[PDB]
Symmetry: C2
Subunit: 95 residues, 2 copies
Amino acid sequence: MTELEAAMGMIIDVFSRYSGSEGSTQTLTKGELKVLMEKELPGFLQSGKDKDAVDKLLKDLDANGDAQVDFSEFIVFVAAITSASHKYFEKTGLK
Amino acid sequence: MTELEAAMGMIIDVFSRYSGSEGSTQTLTKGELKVLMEKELPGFLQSGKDKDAVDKLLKDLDANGDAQVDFSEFIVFVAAITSASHKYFEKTGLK
């Protein structure tokens, strides 16, 4: 757990706040994932939830499970979420 | 940026330090990378450099650019290094 590894430590932690330990099984279901989004995924809120984009913050990662997103699927796509927000955040976050 | 993306802030930050404006272009070249991993991947350093192992800590993310790793490519590999981060539990449950 260096600097990069500790940041992922807190993303695995975030997942361990909202999957909570278990909330489904030890995954974000689509119905859990939403309550996390308004807090830890601003900007992906362009739809805000409506089973449409909470569904895409699922469907992207969901490929690694089914639709109950494990910590693997989540942490892997938190490293995709960076590469989504940098397409245009306020400017192109980090370009 | 969010909490999740402030954490992404620090997993990208390692790349915002070394490649941290340009160094290569704005990629980890293999020759820049080799002094970072001593600091932010200490568990890879069981190999250490070898011009063929710093090269595999390249070739896994070099999928982008054959020896010039961009930010969004390092970051995918970093979200595999989350499975090395641990030290104690989900991450390190005792920090």
